[PDB]
């Protein structure tokens, strides 16, 4: 996250860190046994780390639970990042409390102008590299589909939305991938891609979670 703020320990209780010996992606806890992330975060040997603030220090609220199964969206295209969404099943259920909590799926798609909270442990610089140990937060609006298409001609599908600031300076970034975009207490987006980070006229592009609810629910019900 570039140009965000320190969230505060366990203020984003649905935020997960995906760990394969190191933090490589974010994710969202959507019930006691399932995590949603980006399909581009797929790898085998995932440990899900819940209740994290400082990902380098054991602070006492963590749950570390292995993934039993990963399910990449059947139509995920790694070239276009269309349908950039994956489900991860935990080997056992997370213990839910005020610091580890599921985020609701949306019943409606969020409109342009909706303010959202994006969170992650990604790079905090637009040029060069500085990875924070503690969770960073950013409040950002959803941009009009027309702004979004103007910024990224020929790359935005109906399964993507833009959020952020066309002036630049405030964005998600590498290592925020797979993390949440929450608007009015509902998971609306997954941190998917962008051209660099926090560049002028190049906002963040997010997987449009409202399009995937039936797929998420039917997948969870049978696995
Ligand atoms: Ca920790």
Author numbering: 24 to 246
Manuscript text:
The following compounds were used: benzamidine, 4-methoxybenzamidine, 4-bromobenzamidine, serotonin, 5-methoxytryptamine, 5-chlorotryptamine and tryptamine. In order to form ligand-bound trypsin crystals, the compounds in DMSO at a volume of 50 nl were introduced into a 500 nl crystallization drop and data were collected after overnight soaking. In situ diffraction measurements of trypsin crystals into which the compounds had been introduced by the acoustic liquid handler were carried out by collecting 10° data from each of 18–24 crystals, processing each wedge independently and merging the data. The results showed that the overall completeness of the data was 91.4–99.5%. The crystal structures of these complexes showed a high degree of similarity to the structures obtained from the data measured at room temperature, including the surrounding water molecules.
